[PDB]
Amino acid sequence: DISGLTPCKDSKQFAKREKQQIKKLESSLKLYAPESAPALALNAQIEKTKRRFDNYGKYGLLCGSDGLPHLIVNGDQRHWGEFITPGILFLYIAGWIGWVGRSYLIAISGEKKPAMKEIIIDVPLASRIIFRGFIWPVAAYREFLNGDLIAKDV
Amino acid sequence: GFTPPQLDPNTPSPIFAGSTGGLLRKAQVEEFYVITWNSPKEQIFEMPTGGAAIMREGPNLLKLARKEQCLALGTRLRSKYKITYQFYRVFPNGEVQYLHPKDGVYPEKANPGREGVGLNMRSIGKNVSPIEVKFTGKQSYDL
Amino acid sequence: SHSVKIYDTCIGCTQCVRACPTDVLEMIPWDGCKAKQIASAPRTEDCVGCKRCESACPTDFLSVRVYLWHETTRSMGLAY
Amino acid sequence: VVQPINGDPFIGSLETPVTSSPLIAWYLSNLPGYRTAVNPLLRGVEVGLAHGFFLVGPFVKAGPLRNTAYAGSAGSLAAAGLVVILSMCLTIYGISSFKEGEPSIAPSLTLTGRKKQPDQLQTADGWAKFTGGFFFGGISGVTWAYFLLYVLDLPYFVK
Amino acid sequence: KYGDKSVYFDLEDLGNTTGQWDVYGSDAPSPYNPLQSKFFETFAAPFTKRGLLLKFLILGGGSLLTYVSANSTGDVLPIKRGPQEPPKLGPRGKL
Amino acid sequence: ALRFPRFSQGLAQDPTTRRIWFGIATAHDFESHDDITEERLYQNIFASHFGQLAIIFLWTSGNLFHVAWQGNFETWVQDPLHVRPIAHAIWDPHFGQPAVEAFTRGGALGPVNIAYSGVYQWWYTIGLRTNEDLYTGALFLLFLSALSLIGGWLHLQPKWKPRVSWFKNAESRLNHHLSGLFGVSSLAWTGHLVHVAIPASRGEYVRWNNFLNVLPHPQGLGPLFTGQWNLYAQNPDSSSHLFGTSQGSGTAILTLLGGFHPQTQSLWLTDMAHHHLAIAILFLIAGHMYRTNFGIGHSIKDLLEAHIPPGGRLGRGHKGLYDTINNSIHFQLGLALASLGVITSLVAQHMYSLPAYAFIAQDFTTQAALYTHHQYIAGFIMTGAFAHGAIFFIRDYNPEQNEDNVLARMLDHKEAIISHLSWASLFLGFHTLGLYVHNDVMLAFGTPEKQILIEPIFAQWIQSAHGKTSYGFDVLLSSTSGPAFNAGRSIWLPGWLNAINENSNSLFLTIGPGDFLVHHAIALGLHTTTLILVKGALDARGSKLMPDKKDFGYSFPCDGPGRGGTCDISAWDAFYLAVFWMLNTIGWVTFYWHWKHITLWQGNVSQFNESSTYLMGWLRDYLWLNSSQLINGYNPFGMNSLSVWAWMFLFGHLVWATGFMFLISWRGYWQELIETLAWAHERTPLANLIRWKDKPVALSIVQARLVGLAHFSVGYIFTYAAFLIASTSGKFG
Amino acid sequence: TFNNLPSIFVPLVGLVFPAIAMASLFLHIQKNK
Ligand code: CLA
Numbered sequence A: 001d002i003s004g005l006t007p008c009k010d011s012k013q014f015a016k017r018e019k020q021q022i023k024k025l026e027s028s029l030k031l032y033a034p035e036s037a038p039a040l041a042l043n044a045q046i047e048k049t050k051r052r053f054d055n056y057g058k059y060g061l062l063c064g065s066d067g068l069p070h071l072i073v074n075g076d077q078r079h080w081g082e083f084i085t086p087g088i089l090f091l092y093i094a095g096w097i098g099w100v101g102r103s104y105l106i107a108i109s110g111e112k113k114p115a116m117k118e119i120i121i122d123v124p125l126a127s128r129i130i131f132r133g134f135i136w137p138v139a140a141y142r143e144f145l146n147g148d149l150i151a152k153d154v
Numbered sequence B: 001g002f003t004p005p006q007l008d009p010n011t012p013s014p015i016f017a018g019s020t021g022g023l024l025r026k027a028q029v030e031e032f033y034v035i036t037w038n039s040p041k042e043q044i045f046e047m048p049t050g051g052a053a054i055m056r057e058g059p060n061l062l063k064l065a066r067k068e069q070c071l072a073l074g075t076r077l078r079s080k081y082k083i084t085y086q087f088y089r090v091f092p093n094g095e096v097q098y099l100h101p102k103d104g105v106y107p108e109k110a111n112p113g114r115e116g117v118g119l120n121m122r123s124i125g126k127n128v129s130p131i132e133v134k135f136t137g138k139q140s141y142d143l
Numbered sequence C: 001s002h003s004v005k006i007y008d009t010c011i012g013c014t015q016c017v018r019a020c021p022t023d024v025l026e027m028i029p030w031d032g033c034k035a036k037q038i039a040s041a042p043r044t045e046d047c048v049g050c051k052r053c054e055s056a057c058p059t060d061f062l063s064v065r066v067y068l069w070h071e072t073t074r075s076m077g078l079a080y
Numbered sequence D: 001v002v003q004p005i006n007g008d009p010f011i012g013s014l015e016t017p018v019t020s021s022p023l024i025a026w027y028l029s030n031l032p033g034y035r036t037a038v039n040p041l042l043r044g045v046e047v048g049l050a051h052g053f054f055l056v057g058p059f060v061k062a063g064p065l066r067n068t069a070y071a072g073s074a075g076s077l078a079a080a081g082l083v084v085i086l087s088m089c090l091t092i093y094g095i096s097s098f099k100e101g102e103p104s105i106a107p108s109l110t111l112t113g114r115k116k117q118p119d120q121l122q123t124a125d126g127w128a129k130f131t132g133g134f135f136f137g138g139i140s141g142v143t144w145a146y147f148l149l150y151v152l153d154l155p156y157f158v159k
Numbered sequence E: 001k002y003g004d005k006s007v008y009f010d011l012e013d014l015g016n017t018t019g020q021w022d023v024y025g026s027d028a029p030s031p032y033n034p035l036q037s038k039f040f041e042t043f044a045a046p047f048t049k050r051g052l053l054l055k056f057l058i059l060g061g062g063s064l065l066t067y068v069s070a071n072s073t074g075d076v077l078p079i080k081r082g083p084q085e086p087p088k089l090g091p092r093g094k095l
Numbered sequence F: 001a002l003r004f005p006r007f008s009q010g011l012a013q014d015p016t017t018r019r020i021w022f023g024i025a026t027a028h029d030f031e032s033h034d035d036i037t038e039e040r041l042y043q044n045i046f047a048s049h050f051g052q053l054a055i056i057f058l059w060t061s062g063n064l065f066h067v068a069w070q071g072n073f074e075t076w077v078q079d080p081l082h083v084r085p086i087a088h089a090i091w092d093p094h095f096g097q098p099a100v101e102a103f104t105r106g107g108a109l110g111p112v113n114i115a116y117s118g119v120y121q122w123w124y125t126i127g128l129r130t131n132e133d134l135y136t137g138a139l140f141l142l143f144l145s146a147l148s149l150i151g152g153w154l155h156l157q158p159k160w161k162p163r164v165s166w167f168k169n170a171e172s173r174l175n176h177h178l179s180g181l182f183g184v185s186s187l188a189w190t191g192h193l194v195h196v197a198i199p200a201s202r203g204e205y206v207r208w209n210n211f212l213n214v215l216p217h218p219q220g221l222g223p224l225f226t227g228q229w230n231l232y233a234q235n236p237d238s239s240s241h242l243f244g245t246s247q248g249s250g251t252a253i254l255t256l257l258g259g260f261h262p263q264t265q266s267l268w269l270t271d272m273a274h275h276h277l278a279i280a281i282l283f284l285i286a287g288h289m290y291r292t293n294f295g296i297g298h299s300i301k302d303l304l305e306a307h308i309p310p311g312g313r314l315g316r317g318h319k320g321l322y323d324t325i326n327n328s329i330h331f332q333l334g335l336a337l338a339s340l341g342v343i344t345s346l347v348a349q350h351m352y353s354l355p356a357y358a359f360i361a362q363d364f365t366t367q368a369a370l371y372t373h374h375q376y377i378a379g380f381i382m383t384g385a386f387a388h389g390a391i392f393f394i395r396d397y398n399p400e401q402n403e404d405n406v407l408a409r410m411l412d413h414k415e416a417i418i419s420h421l422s423w424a425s426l427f428l429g430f431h432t433l434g435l436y437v438h439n440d441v442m443l444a445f446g447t448p449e450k451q452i453l454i455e456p457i458f459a460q461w462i463q464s465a466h467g468k469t470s471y472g473f474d475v476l477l478s479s480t481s482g483p484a485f486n487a488g489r490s491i492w493l494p495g496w497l498n499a500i501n502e503n504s505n506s507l508f509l510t511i512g513p514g515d516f517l518v519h520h521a522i523a524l525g526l527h528t529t530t531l532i533l534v535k536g537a538l539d540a541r542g543s544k545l546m547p548d549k550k551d552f553g554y555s556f557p558c559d560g561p562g563r564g565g566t567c568d569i570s571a572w573d574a575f576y577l578a579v580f581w582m583l584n585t586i587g588w589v590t591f592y593w594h595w596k597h598i599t600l601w602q603g604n605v606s607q608f609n610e611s612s613t614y615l616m617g618w619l620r621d622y623l624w625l626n627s628s629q630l631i632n633g634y635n636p637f638g639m640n641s642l643s644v645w646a647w648m649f650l651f652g653h654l655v656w657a658t659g660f661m662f663l664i665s666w667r668g669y670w671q672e673l674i675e676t677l678a679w680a681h682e683r684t685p686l687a688n689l690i691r692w693k694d695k696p697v698a699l700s701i702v703q704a705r706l707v708g709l710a711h712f713s714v715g716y717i718f719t720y721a722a723f724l725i726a727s728t729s730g731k732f733g
Numbered sequence G: 001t002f003n004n005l006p007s008i009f010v011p012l013v014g015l016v017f018p019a020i021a022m023a024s025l026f027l028h029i030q031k032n033k
């Protein structure tokens, strides 16, 4: 109920959005037979919409006066599924990408012509490294403590 | 005092049917950079003013528009046809300044007899900042 | 017109002048390198500023160096 | 007959039928722009008269008051104004291009190679006489076009 | 010599070399009548001093322009005629 | 110097036509002029400032004179809400009678232009209730312009010629400017507001013939000398006041009741009086800080040499900085334009929310024109601040005299700064564009419930931290039990609360997810413009690609195709591309402003709060919709008052497209084209008689860049001015 | 006369001041000492 936003499980305009989209998809449904592929696909999209709205209701999303879910990023424990848990889920993958790429560039750095390994990606080397970014939040922390994360100028 | 200028005489010009990239009023009030070369045979070359010209067997003479035209022509001559060339500068008053080798030798062979100017005896980073030469005619690079 | 300067980091490879289409440059003898020659720029009045010289200077940054300055009819490359 | 100018192939022009022909060169040589020896005042008079009519043309019939009764009068007035401005810009041209007393910057030669006299039009006093002739001729041609539109309206088109 | 066989660099006659030619500048004498020429001379010699001509042109033209625009009525230019129409009340009353 | 540029014999010795352009463009670059000194530099700057003041007073006098002569101000004073302002009459002889009939507004006998500058409101709020008042003001400002002109003339003469040691007196100058030019100036403004503007609001007209007799307060200066200042806040116009008449008026002159006047929806004149008074005390106290001829005060040199932190974090601190600023006029100019741009944006952000003029909140085109004006002005002033810092780093920065100090230790980690600003702009652009595009798609898939709508919890927290109960945070001013609310409980908070909670006015608007997203677009714009400018300024001395860039100056085209290519490498070109990004950023700011406000004024805030979260709402519900009455300013069947704004709209489109010519096309195609043209003119009969004096050439690369940006920005500005003015004037909500 | 000042100053300024200014500035351009 924060920021003047009513939850979507007890919002009027949210249910109105639901009803309006369902009537829109049903207006496009009285043009085909109820057993053919178009009508079946339209009914599947209808159930998709209804479950979508009900899932946004049951997660405790906050729907404003416009009747759309307004995500809360401030750090409220009820709304960590909005930003903070998927934010950690992001940063874990993003640091995976960065860490496997960095360890790859460091792996090829001791090559005769390293640039050809950035064009012709050494798939065995990367694949042996591709899972080494699973542990990036600890390996990077140690490389920061040991001094191996940041390079020295010389 | 080792190489005298050549003082181009009334030599013939290449066979050319005439173009529009030729001498405009710049020649009529300023220099127009005659070039002279000496052909082994009557061959055909691209003119720097656009179009194809037929150089004559023996000495030729072309008054094209400017220095870059004659030097581009002469470089194409020396590289493609392997031919000695020399070009001039003809002010409207009448004087004819000799310019391309200025030593009888092209400006790649470091032949002694030419004084070095535009020569800063330092690395390029050791020039002073502009504040050190603020309110002075010397900009950054003439000390 | 333009102010062409040759610094002492030269290697005397004769690419500045062999690229220069207006006879601005010329190689002179010198004692600062293995080739015993360095480029000079007497005919800066004929300098257009095309920087073909310093697009062919193989050094750390440059040894030949063109400074854009008072533009005259011949530095502006006008046939009129 | 497209051979170059004076047979000189490295001059930027050609003696094509349009430039150098018995008819078109004659026409460009016996009109007041190229009558060099004659004084520039009569030249400018001729030029101004012709351009005054040529300007009164597209001001009466084409203009803001073309359909009104003030078409001819106000159009000729605008043509005289444009003529005054043209003499104005001609005047600053003569002041800016050549100062007071220098010799003529015109060519003293001709296609036949004769060391002819330079065109005194290009001098200061000569161009000033030309501008005076242009102004006089232009105002006179404007008022004469107005007179012909007044008294001889019927043969010309109205539309 | 400029007239030799394909010679265009007479260094003495630099006019023929550089292209200094009055391409159509006929040196033929005055084709006008002498009397009308003297008439125009005496009636346009006032416009011989370019500086006085310029001062006269600018000042008299500005004077005539101000005179035309000040003495002209609205019949020849609608801006002087004025509205001759009631003013429309703008949006939201007038604001 | 022989030819027109008397200040550069390098351009006078240029047979081409580049010298005209470069004698225009470098006319005011005195420290690049030939054969000059520092004395002549500062003196020319001083006379130039006199000329600028003369032009400013002349332009204000023209405004006053035309509003008095051709305006309807005496009619605007009576019924301001329902009488239209008039900037000046129009005599365009190209006009047709429909246009003479349409442009006749405000009860005029001829065509007129509606003052969308708000000068009517601000003159009416400070007194000035007759045309004769404006005439006297205009004549006095003309006198002031002539005064500035004669002052700048005589201060150029050798007898009155200040030396560089006088211009560099950065302590006497600071003391005087602070104390007098701010404190005494705002004090005199209070002495106007107390003696004139408030009495003109309270009724009686207090003019020069009778301002010695009229007591501004019934007990004159007894309360001030006796310390009983509370007697100046006794009857503070208790909520029934009609601006311009004694009904519901009072006797106070200095108050802190805060909030808005209920009639005008503007700030109280007594609040402005007390305000200018208080900041006058502050500035008059602060202007007695720096050391002068009287033995006491501070030396800024030792203030800077003393602020060197032990620990070597900043290194040599601010040592040697007084000498590198006082000698460097570009550093002074950069800091000045920094502060000026920030306070200009502040003027905008506080005049839209806290309007200090009567009947300017309720009129809706001036409140937008002023905001847009001052914000584009602030963006330009900020780009110029950074550009002059770059010009400083090239021309007047001496790395030896400020070695290892806060400004060379700055240039060290220029790569760190540039990289982290790049990160911020990259992050913001990526994410916020992704969210706008996600919402564009989710609407395009008919699923607006799937949009990324982030409620701006932090700005809503600040709003609830000021008294807005539209969110229910109840913290520090919406909580009655908060000590911050208890402190000012009896001073300003009643008025401030019934102002901020009133959802008709425009301070602390109810913001939503579209406001979040466009604020992040704004952050992208600021960080990116900052990136471009800071990078140009720090790489002004050099980089790895061009380390000797200080030797080529601030403005040079390039360094050639060598080293891969060096187009737009100068710090001038950083400024250039930053002006592009600045125009973009201010366009976002003013689009956000105008749409939020036009939706508030129309009443349908839901339009913005639903459509601002996806870009097709801006393209449909803001640009396409509000341009309905504009482009119909002149149809094939008739025209209306918005014909001028449609013509200006298309004119700005035209020049904004013409700039693309000078930007996309560069120099070489045009030089060759001009070579063909010169051939044709020199071989075309009857025009061979006419030969140019300045050999024609295509525009230089840096020049044509500048020209493209001039056309681009003129078109940006004129187009958005046309659109904003016409949309807010076609309806006025 | 105040309504007739537009009829005097606008044709004065926007036509003569360009005449005077552009002429004098063209002369200042085309000068030699
Ligand atoms: C190994 C990959 C890698 C790593 C670890 C970094 C790390 C960094 N970059 Mg760089 N960058 C990279 C690749 C990488 N970059 C590539 C390929 C590009 C070209 C698009 C850029 C373009 C770029 C810019 C323009 C900027 C950075 C910045 C940064 C810094 C901030 C992080 C950020 O905002 O992400 C930036 C990420 C992007 C812009 C998206 C591109 C990243 C790609 C998707 C990763 C590529 C991985 C590789 C192909 C996989 C190979 C795996 C191997 C096992 C075979 C950080 C030091 C910023 C900086 O310096 O600020 C401090 C900055 O301004 N980077």
Ligand code: CLA
Residues within 6 Å of the ligand: F045, F046, F049, F050, F053, F166, F167, F168, F169, F172, F173, F176, F177, F179, F180, F181, F182, F185
């Ligand atoms: C108290 C004495 C005093 C005073 C009053 C001034 C006054 C001034 N000096 Mg200074 N000066 C002084 C002593 C003084 N000087 C001394 C002792 C020296 C010794 C070195 C100098 C040296 C000096 C130099 C070298 C220069 C000046 C300049 C100026 C002018 C600044 C430009 C301007 O008008 O903006 C004034 C701006 C403001 C008053 C306010 C700006 C910011 C506010 C906070 C913005 C917000 C409020 C806003 C105004 C509200 C507007 C609302 C509506 C009414 C529009 C100004 C007239 C400059 C000038 O023009 O030369 C003549 C200049 O170049 N002075």
Ligand code: CLA
Residues within 6 Å of the ligand: F421, F422, F423, F425, F426, F427, F428, F429, F430, F433, F524, F528, F531, F532, F577, F578, F580, F581
């Ligand atoms: C819509 C036009 C537009 C856009 C999108 C950009 C974008 C950018 N500019 Mg600006 N710029 C523009 C116009 C634009 N500019 C104009 C007209 C000028 C005047 C010349 C400039 C001048 C300019 C300068 C001078 C600077 C920038 C900078 C930047 C970057 C800022 C960092 C950022 O927000 O990136 C976030 C990323 C984007 C906005 C890219 C959007 C595209 C998406 C994310 C790519 C993914 C889509 C898709 C999967 C890719 C496949 C496509 C296809 C092959 C299938 C960014 C790339 C600055 C910079 O580099 O800082 C880092 C900088 O210094 N620009």
Ligand SMILES: CC1=C(/C=C/C(C)=C/C=C/C(C)=C/C=C/C=C(C)/C=C/C=C(C)/C=C/C2=C(C)CCCC2(C)C)C(C)(C)CCC1
Residues within 6 Å of the ligand: F330, F331, F332, F333, F334, F335, F337, F338, F339, F342, F382, F385, F386, F387, F388, F389, F390, F392, F393, F534, F537
């Ligand atoms: C290039 C350069 C330059 C220029 C630069 C610039 C232009 C900059 C800018 C800058 C800027 C433009 C900045 C800004 C800033 C801001 C800030 C820093 C802010 C702060 C704030 C605060 C601190 C606040 C507080 C508060 C609040 C929150 C509200 C209420 C009240 C209070 C007070 C409490 C120079 C010349 C210098 C030098 C050289 C280099």
Ligand SMILES: CC1=C(/C=C/C(C)=C/C=C/C(C)=C\C=C\C=C(C)\C=C\C=C(C)\C=C\C2=C(C)CCCC2(C)C)C(C)(C)CCC1
Residues within 6 Å of the ligand: A073, A074, A075, A083, A084, A094, A095, A096, A097, A098, A099, A102, A136, A140, A149
């Ligand atoms: C909680 C939160 C928030 C906030 C937050 C913040 C404010 C933060 C900050 C933060 C920060 C302030 C940070 C900083 C940082 C810095 C640095 C300096 C870093 C570095 C790093 C590195 C260097 C790394 C690297 C890597 C990795 C590890 C990954 C991949 C690979 C690489 C190599 C890239 C909010 C409420 C909004 C929302 C919710 C959530």
Ligand SMILES: CC1=C(C/C=C(\C)CCC[C@H](C)CCC[C@H](C)CCCC(C)C)C(=O)c2ccccc2C1=O
Residues within 6 Å of the ligand: F024, F661, F662, F663, F665, F666, F667, F668, F670, F671, F697, F698, F699, F700, F701, F704, F705
């Ligand atoms: C169109 C174009 C031209 C051609 C432009 C010419 C040569 C100059 C403009 C032609 C006339 C002079 C139009 C002038 C318009 C204004 C009236 C001038 C205002 C200046 C006064 C205030 C002094 C270039 O030379 C060029 C050069 C480099 C990059 C891009 C371009 C480019 O895009």
